[PDB]
Design a protein around this nucleic acid. Structure first.
Ligand SMILES: [Mg+2]
Ligand SMILES: [Mg+2]
Ligand SMILES: [Mg+2]
Ligand SMILES: [Mg+2]
Ligand SMILES: [Mg+2]
Ligand SMILES: [Mg+2]
Ligand SMILES: [Mg+2]
Ligand SMILES: [Mg+2]
Ligand SMILES: [Mg+2]
Ligand SMILES: [Mg+2]
Ligand SMILES: [Mg+2]
Ligand SMILES: [Mg+2]
Ligand SMILES: [Mg+2]
Ligand SMILES: [Mg+2]
Ligand SMILES: [Mg+2]
Ligand SMILES: [Mg+2]
Ligand SMILES: [Mg+2]
Ligand SMILES: [Mg+2]
Ligand SMILES: [Mg+2]
Ligand SMILES: [Mg+2]
Ligand SMILES: [Mg+2]
Ligand SMILES: [Mg+2]
Ligand SMILES: [Mg+2]
Ligand SMILES: [Mg+2]
Ligand SMILES: [Mg+2]
Ligand SMILES: [Mg+2]
Ligand SMILES: [Mg+2]
Ligand SMILES: [Mg+2]
Ligand SMILES: [Mg+2]
Ligand SMILES: [Mg+2]
Ligand SMILES: [Mg+2]
Ligand SMILES: [Mg+2]
Ligand SMILES: [Mg+2]
Ligand SMILES: [Mg+2]
Ligand SMILES: [Mg+2]
Ligand SMILES: [Mg+2]
Ligand SMILES: [Mg+2]
Ligand SMILES: [Mg+2]
Ligand SMILES: [Mg+2]
Ligand SMILES: [Mg+2]
Ligand SMILES: [Mg+2]
Ligand SMILES: [Mg+2]
Ligand SMILES: [Mg+2]
Ligand SMILES: [Mg+2]
Ligand SMILES: [Mg+2]
Ligand SMILES: [Mg+2]
Ligand SMILES: [Mg+2]
Ligand SMILES: [Mg+2]
Ligand SMILES: [Mg+2]
Ligand SMILES: [Mg+2]
Ligand SMILES: [Mg+2]
Ligand SMILES: [Mg+2]
Ligand SMILES: [Mg+2]
Ligand SMILES: [Mg+2]
Ligand SMILES: [Mg+2]
Ligand SMILES: [Mg+2]
Ligand SMILES: [Mg+2]
Ligand SMILES: [Mg+2]
Ligand SMILES: [Mg+2]
Ligand SMILES: [Mg+2]
Ligand SMILES: [Mg+2]
Ligand SMILES: [Mg+2]
Ligand SMILES: [Mg+2]
Ligand SMILES: [Mg+2]
Ligand SMILES: [Mg+2]
Ligand SMILES: [Mg+2]
Ligand SMILES: [Mg+2]
Ligand SMILES: [Mg+2]
Ligand SMILES: [Mg+2]
Ligand SMILES: [Mg+2]
Ligand SMILES: [Mg+2]
Lengths: 260, 177
RNA sequence: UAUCUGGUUGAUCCUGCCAGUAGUCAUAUGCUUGUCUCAAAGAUUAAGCCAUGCAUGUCUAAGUAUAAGCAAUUUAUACAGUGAAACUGCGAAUGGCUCAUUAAAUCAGUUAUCGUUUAUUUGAUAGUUCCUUACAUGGUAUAACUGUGGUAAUUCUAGAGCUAAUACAUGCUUAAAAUCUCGACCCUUUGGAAGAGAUGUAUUUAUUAGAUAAAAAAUCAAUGUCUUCGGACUGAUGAUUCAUAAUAACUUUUCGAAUCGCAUGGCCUUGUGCUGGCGAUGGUUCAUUCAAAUUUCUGCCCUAUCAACUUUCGAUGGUAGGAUAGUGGCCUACCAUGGUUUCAACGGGUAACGGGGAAUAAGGGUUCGAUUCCGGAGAGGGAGCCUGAGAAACGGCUACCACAUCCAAGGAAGGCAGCAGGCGCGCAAAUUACCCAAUCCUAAUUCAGGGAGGUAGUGACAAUAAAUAACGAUACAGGGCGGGUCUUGUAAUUGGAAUGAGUACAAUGUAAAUACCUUAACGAGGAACAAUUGGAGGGCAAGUCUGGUGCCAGCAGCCGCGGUAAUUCCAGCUCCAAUAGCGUAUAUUAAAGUUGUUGCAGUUAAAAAGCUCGUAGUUGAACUUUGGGCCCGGUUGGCCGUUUCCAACGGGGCCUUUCCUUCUGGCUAACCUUGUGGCUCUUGGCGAACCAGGACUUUUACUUUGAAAAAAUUAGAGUGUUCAAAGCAGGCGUAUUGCUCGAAUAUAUUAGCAUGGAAUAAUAGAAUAGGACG
RNA sequence: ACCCACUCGGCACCUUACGAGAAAUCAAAGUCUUUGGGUUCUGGGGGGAGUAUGGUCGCAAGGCUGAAACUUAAAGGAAUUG
RNA sequence: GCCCGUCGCUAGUACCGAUUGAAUGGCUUAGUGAGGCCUCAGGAUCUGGGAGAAUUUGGACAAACUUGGUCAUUUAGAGGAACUAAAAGUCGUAACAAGGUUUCCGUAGGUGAACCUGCGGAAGGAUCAU
RNA sequence: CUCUUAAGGUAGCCAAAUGCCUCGUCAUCUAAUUAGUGACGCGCAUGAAUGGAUUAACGAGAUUCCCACUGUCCCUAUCUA
């Protein structure tokens, strides 16, 4: 239909952004950038909806134009910037830092983190191959290319990112028994750390996961994001650490906090 | 472009339209609880048939099926929280049996009468409307509140209502002038 | 939320339709209309035609300012502030509108690129540009402008005179190093050398590398490091010609910064020397992201009064090319004769865009979807094309057709299925208003722009809440147990209370208003602030009251009423139903088990071909591991208040002659292992638990579970929107500078994927053995 | 050839009714609201009308296929009484 | 009692039908062919072999016009021939009772009209019977 | 009903090359049609091997209309023998 769509109606918007229907007609169409459109979150909703710092959209532009906000290090003044899972948002005022991490309800949660933690990053490597001059590179879920990794990094593995500079130092591997993070379907949010991987040559390798409540589940490999060792992660998980409380579990504890 | 504003209907309608058995019967309920429309009756039959063929459907599931209890025990909580199902009856075979009048006796226009304080069942409906009685500071002019038996405790009049401690009121003030 | 009722007869039971009945996010029209919230709306007919106005423009410290521009300040005699015009750049391909075409098309779910394009965003990537020379930086040729002009007339432009660049057009540069090619001499051997050039990336071609199923030797042609001169001597994929690299060349030779802003500092051997900070625009190639384009599997409504269709003039395939961004009969040349079809091809129809979905509530179904979201198609009808990353664009151009405007008759211009508004069409649908405040969007970009969008008006489309009254005293009267004192209350004087409909200071509300919420002042007794709409023989609730009419007028969805006492018409009265609504027409769903899979009927009511054969289709007897034994630990519930004790209900693994493919190692978790309630514990010994490599696998249907899975819708949890329809909020303190729960769950079901089961129902297997193991 | 008994497959009749049906009647017209053995065909109120139209067969007469507009509240079946 | 058909009135519907009848859309032969694009030329000028306007060759794409054909959806018509409203009027008596010749089916011919007659059937007969 | 006959024209068909009236009436084709065609039929005086009706094919047959075509014509002019 004659080139690029540049609008986003409401109710085309990703559900996990949690926008009320009647506030107009449109969501903010996220821009092009590091994260897939449907798998991301733009700055204007973060600063307006989930975190309620700004009241209207006009204000969010006023905020960013003072170079207040940084993501993964950089000033990043795009009102609709596609900030995505595992990005870090330092905030210059308030000295706040947030890593971008799902709930087990599968939405993007607010999760404050240490100044120390605010300066590394991971990424599911999505591809590895030689390139120009034969210098190998990795590229990962977030949209960056790291030249000269170790030959031991194959694909589907996480990588520590310095993000004051480029390079990696550690690289957790994808094998039986490493901490994982489901980043799709809506086992989205659940956690933990292997059962095994069905090959299925032709497509769509299946990843079996056992949460640390002895509850199984399966999701596709494209959506499993290894994050380290049993009970030993490499970032700060959010509250309740994604173990898929039932509807009755969740409302039994909902009424557990009962007395004021 | 707009997002679609949801709506729904709140009243069903008797299929046989002239069943005089059910038609006198309907009015006895109407002129008892102080209703204006026979569709205030048709209304409160509607939810009932919803609760029933919500509830009736749950007792088909294998006994204590996962969701049958979640919304089972969610349901009977909702109805005692308004006080139509009595506290004996919270295991949901008896919610099939909420004869309609139970729902009407738990109105606001009704209890404002059964607490005394309404000379008639209609002195009730007339004062609820007219800036009169409340629960908190929260005035209520809806004779169909369905007061929830918790906030039934505080149903004294409002502070601005010149029947429960106020200024004289509009036509008294120059009957005296 | 599983219901019937009126009408065939003298009466009867049937079959059966008609009528009744209820709903409709279902249109219209009629009568009536007070409040809150909510808020659809020129789809249907004519994708018919359109006056006018508006709907796309855009500048940062940071490409271009000698405005004969405003402003003057201020280090600024090149520039500097501010900035019209104009260039340059970017956008104008999103949005919004409509449903015309479209029926294997679109669309949906599921796939594919090892089958391509990809502005942008984001991350990476550039010591090479010369030659047997401006780098302290190279060229005009133009807008704006000035000025002279034309024409009735337009976003018409001509002639002449200037001047810019991140426009146009050009054109230098940098270390080392190594490897290749030539090779003047010397000197004959085992042969080596001075130094001569070549070697950036991109394009085009050919050649090569890109290993790897377990191990080894001999030789011909070359010919590499070390002489102890016999001699010895490494990526990814399931999958590629992949990523990447090497060699010989090729190119009207792509890129390799002549750009801009804010600062200005080091460092002597004081050269206009050499250096150097932050960030902006660009720039090839790769990656990312927003995409696009094709594409796999399966699924469309009625039709046989459509049975054969497809190659004229591609129909189906092969080869080669051409064209494409790329695959492909996409196109061409040559060759072949294929391709679809009763399992409905092909054709026709469609008052046909597809879907998410809507209506109808026992279920199974039936019907609808122009229409807020996704996809597609179009801009009066066609076709063509420029620009560009992206268009076969139409608020772009070009041509034809149709329509059609202005004129000075020479010519020029128009495309509302954008907003509003107009004509027409009709049963059928609103203002030529306000704003960028919100929601988002675009630009050079915090600022500008946005009839996207939001505000009001119009607005009984639908949807929610629910005023038109409420308490008395009395008086004859009933009845409670003479009226007494308990009200049933029927009262034709009364009675003090209450209130918003309205009105309106005010604040609130709002971009500015408006309403609503809140609230002074006003604001109710019958003259009112006065509820309607239908109906009163039956179905069907409510009178054989009164007056009128006299088979007339009229009623009557249906059965039937009226021809002079009309239970039916026209009225008065009284009465019923629903009630801010109610009637009528049309469609549709329920009732309808009158479309019947569930679930009909066919002797005589409608309906078994006159008869048998018989292809398609549908269907199709029985019999192949049953039975027994050991074990493990699961989930309810019991007696106890989970160890063990009892029942019962399921899961797995064993051994019973018992593929579980199969090996070659890697793995072993498990034991036969080395007082048996109990478990740590290495030194012989479980397999299949699955890695990954090899080898090789009869085909299905069904059922389980699971993944993949848009929102809104629906079902539904939480939450007291004053209630409710809704909404996705909200709830707590220290209400002095915060605390905190949320935003569930369910749902896809046909097809595809994955997985467990082996009953049921198929297919296949050894009979001329051309069998099976070795 | 005839008699008797049984058994297969025939043409029928008889008595019953468990059962069925609106009934007359039916060993099927039964084993149906306790609705499923397999399969074929036709019917969906009455007229209009087996008419019109096309196709096709025939020498013809005609055969097969086979509508609609409109009209209408009945038409029909079996049994009862007259 | 019921009841059939021709015949006659009024009204409505649809059919057949000279007009080689009309109309609206979808394709499409043949013929003519705009335009832009690609291309052979061209060379007003304007310059360092290049540019480049008018013009032009040949192409593919292809609107469109003329005359046809085809499909689909409509549709005017003298007249003819049905049906209905429809119950009645005219003429008769066909059926219903052995309906006064029992009725009906197929076929054939004839008759104002219902109908009659021949050949073969059925009982739904007026006979479940020697 | 009536007079009357040997019998009283049936099936068919038509203003037909058969119709007086007559240039019949209606439709159709045309600007206009004593033409043509299709209908109508108390048909002066249609009609059954005096053969009736229908017919593909055939026609130097009579008739009407269309396309093409043309000096037939508007309206004539020129050339050759
Ligand atoms: Mg955006
Ligand atoms: Mg009757
Ligand atoms: Mg009767
Ligand atoms: Mg009688
Ligand atoms: Mg009906
Ligand atoms: Mg329209
Ligand atoms: Mg519309
Ligand atoms: Mg139009
Ligand atoms: Mg200046
Ligand atoms: Mg668009
Ligand atoms: Mg497509
Ligand atoms: Mg020049
Ligand atoms: Mg390899
Ligand atoms: Mg390659
Ligand atoms: Mg200096
Ligand atoms: Mg047809
Ligand atoms: Mg080919
Ligand atoms: Mg062939
Ligand atoms: Mg078919
Ligand atoms: Mg259509
Ligand atoms: Mg359903
Ligand atoms: Mg139906
Ligand atoms: Mg739609
Ligand atoms: Mg549809
Ligand atoms: Mg339409
Ligand atoms: Mg166009
Ligand atoms: Mg427009
Ligand atoms: Mg447009
Ligand atoms: Mg002039
Ligand atoms: Mg308009
Ligand atoms: Mg309307
Ligand atoms: Mg607007
Ligand atoms: Mg608007
Ligand atoms: Mg009123
Ligand atoms: Mg009053
Ligand atoms: Mg009335
Ligand atoms: Mg009644
Ligand atoms: Mg009356
Ligand atoms: Mg109603
Ligand atoms: Mg079934
Ligand atoms: Mg039936
Ligand atoms: Mg019969
Ligand atoms: Mg038979
Ligand atoms: Mg047959
Ligand atoms: Mg079997
Ligand atoms: Mg599931
Ligand atoms: Mg026998
Ligand atoms: Mg019996
Ligand atoms: Mg019986
Ligand atoms: Mg024939
Ligand atoms: Mg003609
Ligand atoms: Mg060419
Ligand atoms: Mg007819
Ligand atoms: Mg008779
Ligand atoms: Mg008689
Ligand atoms: Mg007789
Ligand atoms: Mg008889
Ligand atoms: Mg005749
Ligand atoms: Mg003649
Ligand atoms: Mg005349
Ligand atoms: Mg004539
Ligand atoms: Mg003539
Ligand atoms: Mg004639
Ligand atoms: Mg004649
Ligand atoms: Mg005469
Ligand atoms: Mg004669
Ligand atoms: Mg003769
Ligand atoms: Mg003859
Ligand atoms: Mg013949
Ligand atoms: Mg002739
Ligand atoms: Mg003639």
């Amino acid at each position: 239909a004659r080139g690029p769509k540049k609008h986003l109606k409401r109710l085309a918007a990703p559900h996990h952004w949690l926008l009320d229907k009647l506030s107009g007609c449109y969501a903010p169409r996220p821009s092009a950038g590091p994260h897939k459109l449907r798998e991301s979150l733009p700055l204007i909703v973060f600063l307006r909806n989930r975190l309620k710092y700004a009241l209207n959209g006009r204000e969010v532009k006023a905020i960013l134009m003072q170079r207040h906000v940084k993501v993964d290090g950089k000033v990043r003044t795009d009102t609709t910037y596609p900030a995505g899972f595992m990005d870090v948002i330092t905030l210059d005022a308030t000295n706040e830092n947030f890593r971008l991490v799902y709930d087990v309800k599968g939405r993007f949660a607010v999760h404050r983190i240490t100044d120390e933690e605010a300066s590394y990053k991971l990424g599911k490597v999505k591809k590895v191959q030689l390139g120009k001059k034969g210098v190998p590179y990795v590229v990962t879920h977030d949209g960056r290319t790291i030249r000269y990794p170790d030959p031991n990094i194959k694909v589907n593995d996480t990588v520590k990112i310095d993000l004051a500079s480029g390079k990696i130092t550690d690289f957790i591997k994808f094998d039986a028994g490493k901490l994982v993070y489901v980043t799709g379907g809506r086992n989205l949010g659940r956690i933990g750390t292997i059962v095994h991987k069905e090959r299925h040559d032709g497509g769509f390798d299946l990843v079996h996961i056992k949460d640390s409540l002895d509850n199984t589940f399966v999701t596709r490999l494209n959506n499993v994001f290894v994050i380290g060792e049993q009970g030993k992660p490499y970032i700060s998980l959010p509250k309740g650490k994604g173990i898929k409380l039932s509807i009755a579990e969740e409302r039994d504890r909902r009424r557990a906090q009962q007395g004021l | 472009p707009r997002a679609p504003r949801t709506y729904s209907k709140t009243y069903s309608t008797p299929k046989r339209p002239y069943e005089s058995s059910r038609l006198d019967a309907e009015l006895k309920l109407a002129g008892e609880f102080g209703l204006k429309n026979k569709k205030e009756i048709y209304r409160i039959s509607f939810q009932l048939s919803k609760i029933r063929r919500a509830a009736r459907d749950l007792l088909t599931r294998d006994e204590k099926d996962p969701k049958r209890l979640f919304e089972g025990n969610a349901l009977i909580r909702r109805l005692v929280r308004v006080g139509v199902l009595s506290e004996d009856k919270k295991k949901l075979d008896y919610v099939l049996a909420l004869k309609v009048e139970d729902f009407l006796e738990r109105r606001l226009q009704t209890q404002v009468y059964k607490l005394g304080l309404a000379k008639s069942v209609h002195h009730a409906r007339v004062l609820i409307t007219q800036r009169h009685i409340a629960v908190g500071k929260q005035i209520v002019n809806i004779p169909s509140f369905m007061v929830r038996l918790d906030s039934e405790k505080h149903i004294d009049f409002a502070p601005t209502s010149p029947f429960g401690g106020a200024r004289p009121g509009r036509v008294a003030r120059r009957n005296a002038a």
